Short mmCIF file of C-alpha atoms in Angstrom, two decimals:
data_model
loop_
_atom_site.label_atom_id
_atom_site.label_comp_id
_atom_site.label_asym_id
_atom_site.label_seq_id
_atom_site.Cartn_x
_atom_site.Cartn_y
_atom_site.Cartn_z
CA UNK A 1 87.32 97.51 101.74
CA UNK A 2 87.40 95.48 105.14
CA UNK A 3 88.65 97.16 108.22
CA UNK A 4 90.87 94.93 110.70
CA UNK A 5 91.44 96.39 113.76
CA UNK A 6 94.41 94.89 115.94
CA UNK A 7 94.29 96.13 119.34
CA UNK A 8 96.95 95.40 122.19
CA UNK A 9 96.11 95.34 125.54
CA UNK A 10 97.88 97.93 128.98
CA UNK A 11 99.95 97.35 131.77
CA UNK A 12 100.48 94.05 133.39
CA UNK A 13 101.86 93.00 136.58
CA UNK A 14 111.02 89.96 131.95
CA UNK A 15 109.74 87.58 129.00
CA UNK A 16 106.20 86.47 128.78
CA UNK A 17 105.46 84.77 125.44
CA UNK A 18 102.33 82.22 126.62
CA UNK A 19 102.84 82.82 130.10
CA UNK A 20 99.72 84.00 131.75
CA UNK A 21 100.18 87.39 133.04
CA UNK A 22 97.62 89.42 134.71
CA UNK A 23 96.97 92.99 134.05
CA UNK A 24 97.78 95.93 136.41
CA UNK A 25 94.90 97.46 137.92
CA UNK A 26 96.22 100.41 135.96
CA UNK A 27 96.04 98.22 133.17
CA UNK A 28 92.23 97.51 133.98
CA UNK A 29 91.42 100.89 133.19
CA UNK A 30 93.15 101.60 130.00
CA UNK A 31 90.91 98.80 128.74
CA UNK A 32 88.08 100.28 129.87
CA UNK A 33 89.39 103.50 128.08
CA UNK A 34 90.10 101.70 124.86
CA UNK A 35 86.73 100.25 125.04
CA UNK A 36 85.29 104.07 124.66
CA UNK A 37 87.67 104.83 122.10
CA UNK A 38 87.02 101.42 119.29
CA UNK A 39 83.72 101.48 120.99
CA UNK A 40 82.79 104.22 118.91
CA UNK A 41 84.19 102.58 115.60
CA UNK A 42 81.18 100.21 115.99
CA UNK A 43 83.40 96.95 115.74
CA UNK A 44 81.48 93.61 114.05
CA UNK A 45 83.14 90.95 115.23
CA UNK A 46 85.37 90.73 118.75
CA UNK A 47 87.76 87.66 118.89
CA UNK A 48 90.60 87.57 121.27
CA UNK A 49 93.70 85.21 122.52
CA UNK A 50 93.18 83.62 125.26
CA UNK A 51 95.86 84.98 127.25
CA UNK A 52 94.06 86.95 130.29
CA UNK A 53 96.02 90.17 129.60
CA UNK A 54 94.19 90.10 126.39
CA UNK A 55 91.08 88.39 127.03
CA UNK A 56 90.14 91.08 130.02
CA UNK A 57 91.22 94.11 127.48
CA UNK A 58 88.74 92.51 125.04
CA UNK A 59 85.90 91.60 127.76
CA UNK A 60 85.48 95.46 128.04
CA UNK A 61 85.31 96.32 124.49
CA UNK A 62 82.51 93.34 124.38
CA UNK A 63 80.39 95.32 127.10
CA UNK A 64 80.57 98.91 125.64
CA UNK A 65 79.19 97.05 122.33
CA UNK A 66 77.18 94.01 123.58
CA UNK A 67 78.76 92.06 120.96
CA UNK A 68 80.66 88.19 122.37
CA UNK A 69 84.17 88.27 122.88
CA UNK A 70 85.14 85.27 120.47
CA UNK A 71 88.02 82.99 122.03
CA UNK A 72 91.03 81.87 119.49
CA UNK A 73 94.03 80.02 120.49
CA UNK A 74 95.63 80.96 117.04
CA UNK A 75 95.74 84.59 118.59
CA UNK A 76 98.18 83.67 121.52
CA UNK A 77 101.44 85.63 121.88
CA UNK A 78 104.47 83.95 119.78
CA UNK A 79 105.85 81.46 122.14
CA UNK A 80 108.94 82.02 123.45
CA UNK A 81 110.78 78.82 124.90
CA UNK A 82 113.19 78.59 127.59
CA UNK A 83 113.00 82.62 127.18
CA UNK A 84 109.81 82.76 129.35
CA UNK A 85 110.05 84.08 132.53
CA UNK A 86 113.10 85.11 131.92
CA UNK A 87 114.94 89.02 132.44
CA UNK A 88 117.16 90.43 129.59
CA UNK A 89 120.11 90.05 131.87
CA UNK A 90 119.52 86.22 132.65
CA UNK A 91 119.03 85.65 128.54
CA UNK A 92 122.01 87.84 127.67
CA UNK A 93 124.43 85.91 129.94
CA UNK A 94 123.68 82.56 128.04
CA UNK A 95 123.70 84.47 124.33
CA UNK A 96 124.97 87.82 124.09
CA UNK A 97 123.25 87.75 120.62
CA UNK A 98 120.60 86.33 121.06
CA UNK A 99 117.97 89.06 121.54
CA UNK A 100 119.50 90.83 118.84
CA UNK A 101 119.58 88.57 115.97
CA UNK A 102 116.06 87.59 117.10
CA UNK A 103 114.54 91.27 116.59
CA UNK A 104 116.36 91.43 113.20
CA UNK A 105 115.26 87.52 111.72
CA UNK A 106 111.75 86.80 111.30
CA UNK A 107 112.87 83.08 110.89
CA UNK A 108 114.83 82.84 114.38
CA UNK A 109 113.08 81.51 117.04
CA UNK A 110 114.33 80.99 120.67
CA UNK A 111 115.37 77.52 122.07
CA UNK A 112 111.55 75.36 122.34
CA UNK A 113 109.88 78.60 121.01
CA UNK A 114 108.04 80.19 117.88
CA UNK A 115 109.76 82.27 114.78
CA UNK A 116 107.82 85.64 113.85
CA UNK A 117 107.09 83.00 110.97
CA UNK A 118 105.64 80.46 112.45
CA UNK A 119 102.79 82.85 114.57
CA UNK A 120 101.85 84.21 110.78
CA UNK A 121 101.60 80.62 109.60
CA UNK A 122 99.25 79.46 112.66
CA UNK A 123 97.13 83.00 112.97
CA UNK A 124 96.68 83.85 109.40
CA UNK A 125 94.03 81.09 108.60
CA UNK A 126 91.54 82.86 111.43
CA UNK A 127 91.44 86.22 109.00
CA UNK A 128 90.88 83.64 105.70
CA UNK A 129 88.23 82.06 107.90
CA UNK A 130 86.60 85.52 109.14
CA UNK A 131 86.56 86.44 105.16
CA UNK A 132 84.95 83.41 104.23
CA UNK A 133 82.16 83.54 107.22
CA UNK A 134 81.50 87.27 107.48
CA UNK A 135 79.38 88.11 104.49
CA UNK A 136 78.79 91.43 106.52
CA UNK A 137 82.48 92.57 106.59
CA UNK A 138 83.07 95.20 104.49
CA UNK A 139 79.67 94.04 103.50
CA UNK A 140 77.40 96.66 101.08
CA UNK A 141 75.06 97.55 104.09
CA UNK A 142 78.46 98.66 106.85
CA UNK A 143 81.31 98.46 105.51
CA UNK A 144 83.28 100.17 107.54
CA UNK A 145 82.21 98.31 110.68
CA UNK A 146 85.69 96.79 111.73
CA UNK A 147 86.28 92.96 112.40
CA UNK A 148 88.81 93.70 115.92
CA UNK A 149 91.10 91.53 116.97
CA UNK A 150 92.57 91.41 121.28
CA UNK A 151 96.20 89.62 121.06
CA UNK A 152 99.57 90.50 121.30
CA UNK A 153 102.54 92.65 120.61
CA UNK A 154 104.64 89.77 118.72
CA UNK A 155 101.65 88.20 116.95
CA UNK A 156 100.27 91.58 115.59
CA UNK A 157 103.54 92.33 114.10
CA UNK A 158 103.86 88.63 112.34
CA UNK A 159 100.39 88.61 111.65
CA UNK A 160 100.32 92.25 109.83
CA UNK A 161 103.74 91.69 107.82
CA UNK A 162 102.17 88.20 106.50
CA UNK A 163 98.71 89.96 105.68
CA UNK A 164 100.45 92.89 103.48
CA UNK A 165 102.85 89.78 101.96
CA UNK A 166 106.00 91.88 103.19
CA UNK A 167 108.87 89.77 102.41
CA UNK A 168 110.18 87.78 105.40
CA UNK A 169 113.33 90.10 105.33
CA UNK A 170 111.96 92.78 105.76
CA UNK A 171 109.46 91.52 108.46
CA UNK A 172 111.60 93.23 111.44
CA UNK A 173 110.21 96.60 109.90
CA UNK A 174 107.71 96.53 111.95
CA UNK A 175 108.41 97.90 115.17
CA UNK A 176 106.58 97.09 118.84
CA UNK A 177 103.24 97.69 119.79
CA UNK A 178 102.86 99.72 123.12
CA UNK A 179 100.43 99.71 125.39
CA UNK A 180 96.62 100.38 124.88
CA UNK A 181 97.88 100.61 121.20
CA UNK A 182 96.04 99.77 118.01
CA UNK A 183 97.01 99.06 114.51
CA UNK A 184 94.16 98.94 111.40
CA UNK A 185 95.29 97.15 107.71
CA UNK A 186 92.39 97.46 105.19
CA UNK A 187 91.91 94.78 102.79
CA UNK A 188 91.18 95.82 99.05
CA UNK A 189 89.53 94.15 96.14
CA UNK A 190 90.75 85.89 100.07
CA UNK A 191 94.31 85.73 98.56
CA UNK A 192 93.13 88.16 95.49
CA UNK A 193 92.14 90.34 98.45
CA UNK A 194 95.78 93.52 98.83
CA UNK A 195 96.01 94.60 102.16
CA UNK A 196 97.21 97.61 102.91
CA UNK A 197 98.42 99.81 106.37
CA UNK A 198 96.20 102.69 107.30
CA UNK A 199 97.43 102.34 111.30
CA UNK A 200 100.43 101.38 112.97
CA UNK A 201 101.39 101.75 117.07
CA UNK A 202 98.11 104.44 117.88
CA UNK A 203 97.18 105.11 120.94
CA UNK A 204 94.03 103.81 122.03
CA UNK A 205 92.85 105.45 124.93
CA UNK A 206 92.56 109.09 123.05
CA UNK A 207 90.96 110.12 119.55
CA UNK B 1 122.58 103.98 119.00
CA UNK B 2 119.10 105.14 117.54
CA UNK B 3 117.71 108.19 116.27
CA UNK B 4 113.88 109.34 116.12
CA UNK B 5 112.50 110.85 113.09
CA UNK B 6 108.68 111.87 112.90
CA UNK B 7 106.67 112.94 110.41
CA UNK B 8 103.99 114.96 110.79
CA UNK B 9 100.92 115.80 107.80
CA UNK B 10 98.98 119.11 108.19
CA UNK B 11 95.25 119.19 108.42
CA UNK B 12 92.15 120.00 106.87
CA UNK B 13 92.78 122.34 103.34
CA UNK B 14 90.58 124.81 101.96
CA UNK B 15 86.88 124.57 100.77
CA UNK B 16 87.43 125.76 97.95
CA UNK B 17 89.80 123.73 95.92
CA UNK B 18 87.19 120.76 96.76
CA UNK B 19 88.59 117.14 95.76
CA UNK B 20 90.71 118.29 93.25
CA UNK B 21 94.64 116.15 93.12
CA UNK B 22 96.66 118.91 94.93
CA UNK B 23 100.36 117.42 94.78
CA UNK B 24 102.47 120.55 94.11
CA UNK B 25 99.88 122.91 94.12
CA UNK B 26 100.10 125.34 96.72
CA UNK B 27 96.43 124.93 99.02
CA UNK B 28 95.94 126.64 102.16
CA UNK B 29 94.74 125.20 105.68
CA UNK B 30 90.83 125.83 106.30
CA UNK B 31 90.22 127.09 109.79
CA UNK B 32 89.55 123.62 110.66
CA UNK B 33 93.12 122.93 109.92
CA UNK B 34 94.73 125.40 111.49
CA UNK B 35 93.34 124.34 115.07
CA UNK B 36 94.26 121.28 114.02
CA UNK B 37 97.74 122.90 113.61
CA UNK B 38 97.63 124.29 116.83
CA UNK B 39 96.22 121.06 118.63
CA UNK B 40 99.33 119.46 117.03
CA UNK B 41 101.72 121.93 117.78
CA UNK B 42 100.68 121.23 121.77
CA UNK B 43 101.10 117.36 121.22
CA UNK B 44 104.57 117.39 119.06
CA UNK B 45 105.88 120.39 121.47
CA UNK B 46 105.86 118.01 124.30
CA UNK B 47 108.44 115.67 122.37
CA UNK B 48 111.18 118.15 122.56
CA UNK B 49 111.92 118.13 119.03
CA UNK B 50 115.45 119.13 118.34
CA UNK B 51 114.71 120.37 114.67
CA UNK B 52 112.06 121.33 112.62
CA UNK B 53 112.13 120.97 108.54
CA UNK B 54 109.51 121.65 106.37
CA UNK B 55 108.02 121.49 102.88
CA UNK B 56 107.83 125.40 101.42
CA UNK B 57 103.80 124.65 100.30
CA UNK B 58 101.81 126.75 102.48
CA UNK B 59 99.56 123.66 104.28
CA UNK B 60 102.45 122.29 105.44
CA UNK B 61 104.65 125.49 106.49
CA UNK B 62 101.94 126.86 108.30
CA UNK B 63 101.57 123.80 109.95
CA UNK B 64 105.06 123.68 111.38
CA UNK B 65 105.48 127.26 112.07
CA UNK B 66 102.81 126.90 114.98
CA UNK B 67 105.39 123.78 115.98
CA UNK B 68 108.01 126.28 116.08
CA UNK B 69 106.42 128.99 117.82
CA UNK B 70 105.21 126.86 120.59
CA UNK B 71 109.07 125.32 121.17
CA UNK B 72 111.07 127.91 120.28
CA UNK B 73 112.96 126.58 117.19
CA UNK B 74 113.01 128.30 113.94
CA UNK B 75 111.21 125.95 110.94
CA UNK B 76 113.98 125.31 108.04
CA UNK B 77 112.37 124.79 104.70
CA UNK B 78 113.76 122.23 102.38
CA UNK B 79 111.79 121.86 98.96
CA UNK B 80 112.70 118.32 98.85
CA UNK B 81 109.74 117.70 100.98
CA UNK B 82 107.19 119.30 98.67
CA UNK B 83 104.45 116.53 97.89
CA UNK B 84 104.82 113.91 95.03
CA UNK B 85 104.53 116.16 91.54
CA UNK B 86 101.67 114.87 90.25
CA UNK B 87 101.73 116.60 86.48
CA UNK B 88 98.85 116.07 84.42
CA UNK B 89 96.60 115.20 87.08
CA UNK B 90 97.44 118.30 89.20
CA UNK B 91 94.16 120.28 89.92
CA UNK B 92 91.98 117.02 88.57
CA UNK B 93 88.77 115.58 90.45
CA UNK B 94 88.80 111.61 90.94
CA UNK B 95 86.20 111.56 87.88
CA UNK B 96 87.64 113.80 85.73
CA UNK B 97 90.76 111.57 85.78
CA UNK B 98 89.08 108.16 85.54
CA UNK B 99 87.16 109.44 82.81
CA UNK B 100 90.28 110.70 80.89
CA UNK B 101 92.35 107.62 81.91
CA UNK B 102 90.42 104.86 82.78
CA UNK B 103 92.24 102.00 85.22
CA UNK B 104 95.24 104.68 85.25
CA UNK B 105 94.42 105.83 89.04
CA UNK B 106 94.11 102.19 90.72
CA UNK B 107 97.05 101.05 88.64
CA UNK B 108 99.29 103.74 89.87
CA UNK B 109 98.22 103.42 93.10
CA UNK B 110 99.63 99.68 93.02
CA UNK B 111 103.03 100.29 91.15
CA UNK B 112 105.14 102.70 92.92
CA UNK B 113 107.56 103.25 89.61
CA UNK B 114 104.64 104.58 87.89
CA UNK B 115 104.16 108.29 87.47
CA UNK B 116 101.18 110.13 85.58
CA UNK B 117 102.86 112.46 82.56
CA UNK B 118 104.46 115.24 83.85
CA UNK B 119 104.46 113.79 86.90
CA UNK B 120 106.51 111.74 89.27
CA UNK B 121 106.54 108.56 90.57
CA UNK B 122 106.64 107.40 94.40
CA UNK B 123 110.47 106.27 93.56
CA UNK B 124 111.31 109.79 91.92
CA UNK B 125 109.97 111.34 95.59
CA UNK B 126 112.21 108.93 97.61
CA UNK B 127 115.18 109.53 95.22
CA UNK B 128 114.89 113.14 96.17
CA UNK B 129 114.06 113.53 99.30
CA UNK B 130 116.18 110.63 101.28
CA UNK B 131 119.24 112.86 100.71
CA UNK B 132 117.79 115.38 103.33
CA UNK B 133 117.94 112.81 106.08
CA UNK B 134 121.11 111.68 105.10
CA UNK B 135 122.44 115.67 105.51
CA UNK B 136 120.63 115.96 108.66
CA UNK B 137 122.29 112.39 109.83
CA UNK B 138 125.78 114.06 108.75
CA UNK B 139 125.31 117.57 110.07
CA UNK B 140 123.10 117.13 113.47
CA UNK B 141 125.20 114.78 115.91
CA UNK B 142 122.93 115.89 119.09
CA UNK B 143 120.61 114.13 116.91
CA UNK B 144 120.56 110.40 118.87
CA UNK B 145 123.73 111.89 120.62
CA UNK B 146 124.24 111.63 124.62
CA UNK B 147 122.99 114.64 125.88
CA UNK B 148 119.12 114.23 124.84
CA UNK B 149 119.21 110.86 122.12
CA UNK B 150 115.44 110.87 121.83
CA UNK B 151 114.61 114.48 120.98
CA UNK B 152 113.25 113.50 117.37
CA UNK B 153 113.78 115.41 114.09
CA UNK B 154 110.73 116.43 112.77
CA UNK B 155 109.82 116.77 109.26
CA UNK B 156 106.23 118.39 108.13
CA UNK B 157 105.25 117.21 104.45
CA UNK B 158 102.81 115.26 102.75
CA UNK B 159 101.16 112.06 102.39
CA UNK B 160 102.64 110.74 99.48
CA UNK B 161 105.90 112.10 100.61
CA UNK B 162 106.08 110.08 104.06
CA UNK B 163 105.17 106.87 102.55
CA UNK B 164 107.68 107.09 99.77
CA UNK B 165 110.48 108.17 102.11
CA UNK B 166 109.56 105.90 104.59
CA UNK B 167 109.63 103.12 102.46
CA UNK B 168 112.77 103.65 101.18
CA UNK B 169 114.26 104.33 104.87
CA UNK B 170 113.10 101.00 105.69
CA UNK B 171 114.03 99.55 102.78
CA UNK B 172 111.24 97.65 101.35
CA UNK B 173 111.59 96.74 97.81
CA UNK B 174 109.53 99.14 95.79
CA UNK B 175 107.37 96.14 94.64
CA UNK B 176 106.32 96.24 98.65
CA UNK B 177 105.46 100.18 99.01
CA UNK B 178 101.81 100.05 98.22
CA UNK B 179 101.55 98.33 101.75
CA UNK B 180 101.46 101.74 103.32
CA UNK B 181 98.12 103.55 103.29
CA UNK B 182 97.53 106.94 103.48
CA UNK B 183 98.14 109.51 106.37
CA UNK B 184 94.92 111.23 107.66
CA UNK B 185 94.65 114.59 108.35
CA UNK B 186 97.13 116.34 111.50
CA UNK B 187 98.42 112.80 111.80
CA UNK B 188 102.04 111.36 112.75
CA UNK B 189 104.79 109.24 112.30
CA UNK B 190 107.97 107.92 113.34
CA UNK B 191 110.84 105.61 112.53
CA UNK B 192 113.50 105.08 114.64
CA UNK B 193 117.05 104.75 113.01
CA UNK B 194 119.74 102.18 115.27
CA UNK B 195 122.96 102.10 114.22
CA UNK B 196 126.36 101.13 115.27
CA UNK B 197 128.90 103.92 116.22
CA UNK B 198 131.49 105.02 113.48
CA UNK B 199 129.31 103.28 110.73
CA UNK B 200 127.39 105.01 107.57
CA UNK B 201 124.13 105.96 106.46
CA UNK B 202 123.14 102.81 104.63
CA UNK B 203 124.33 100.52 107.59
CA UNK B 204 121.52 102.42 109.92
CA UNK B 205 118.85 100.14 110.46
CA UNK B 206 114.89 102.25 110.07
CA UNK B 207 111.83 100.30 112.01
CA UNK B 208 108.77 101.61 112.30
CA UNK B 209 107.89 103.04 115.49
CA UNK B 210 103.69 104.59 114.44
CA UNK B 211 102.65 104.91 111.71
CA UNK B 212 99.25 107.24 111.07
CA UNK B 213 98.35 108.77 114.55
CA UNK B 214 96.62 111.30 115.38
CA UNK B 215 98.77 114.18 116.23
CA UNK B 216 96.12 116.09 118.21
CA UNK B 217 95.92 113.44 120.92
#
């Protein structure tokens, strides 16, 4: 069995999507706290988006472990159109619903933006990759070791429902990540490989 | 419009029933697992929970009476949350079942309409035990309501029973429910049920909120 860790970073300085946002210095520390936590799960592999919010959660994981923080577009938050940078109230007023139908179809996508489809269809080939290049992973000498992964709320979600082959109606199961949150799938004797979820929404700066 | 319902599984069971299948049979806690009941009891407590229901099988009533003691609500027992039957294979070690049956125990694991003999299958446990939440849906409307909406419901059960129920409260196809694992021990879960005003059960919409965290924080 391969572990895959999916870890999702704290507080940050309204809708983001590929925007750059910066973390809270609040947010600073729960990654250093979430660094001791899946510090201790001795992770293999590190690769994050490259989204700062992420990619300074994931830089603190890399120095409790001295392992490289791998960089991966294909990790970036769904993007979300004329939506980013946007407030609730501001998107509501052009599409009362809008938001709604969005949290409920996997397949809708904002104007200019990504679908919860789409992000599957562009991140899923990294985990097929990491399979094919990690002889290690879930390897006979550490299997348990987990390959993590830094991204994002809306990719982790996409990226999880495509990885246990969830229908695409039934995607919108899957609820939101909070902050300093991880989720874990384990993947069971790549496309013979089942997936299955032992973690969804934990905290990650307690064990 | 939405409703919190957690799911708690006890901890640690006793030494001496070893890795034997328990299902229905009625373990007890080790002293491991009842700290683990009382570190739990802290961490759900803090929730507000506006209703405690429980299987009747001792690791998992003893679990939620030290819920209800620390909050002050009396634990209802509803034997519609016992654990998944698991006939034949009740009291059996991993090898001893193999051995008997080989390929049975990876197979069932896989096909959620499959149930040992005597036993039942994942389905059977959903079939049974969805009513409750429909009853408690029906008869609880401070449950969601406007005074305290997320005060969850908490039920304390099993591992086979959360995943079957929640499956079916999310409505996955049953082809779909090996996709959730298994719950570790004192561990938690929620789903949160949105719905709109004046409609029924079936309309409510289930996400999942956690799934598998520890419940000892």
């Amino acid at each position: 069995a391969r572990r895959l860790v999916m870890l999702r970073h704290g507080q940050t300085d309204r809708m983001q999507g590929q925007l750059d946002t910066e973390l809270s210095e609040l947010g600073r520390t729960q990654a250093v706290a979430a660094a001791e936590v899946l510090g201790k799960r001795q992770p293999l592999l590190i690769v994050s988006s490259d989204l700062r919010r992420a990619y300074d959660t994931a830089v603190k994981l890399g120095e409790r472990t001295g392992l490289v923080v791998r960089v991966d577009t294909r990790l970036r938050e769904t993007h979300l159109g004329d939506w980013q940078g946007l407030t609730h109230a501001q998107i509501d007023a052009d599409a009362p619903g809008a938001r709604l139908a969005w949290r409920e179809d996997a397949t809708w996508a904002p104007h200019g933006g990504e679908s919860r489809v789409d992000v599957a269809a562009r991140s899923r080939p990294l985990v097929a990759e990491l399979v094919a290049s990690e002889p290690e992973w879930g390897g006979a000498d550490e299997p348990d070791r987990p390959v993590v992964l830094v991204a994002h709320g809306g990719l982790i979600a996409a990226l999880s429902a495509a990885l246990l082959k969830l229908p695409v109606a039934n995607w919108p199961a899957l609820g939101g990540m909070g902050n300093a949150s991880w989720t874990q799938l384990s993947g069971h004797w790549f496309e013979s490989i089942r997936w299955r979820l032992d973690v969804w929404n934990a905290s990650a700066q307690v064990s």
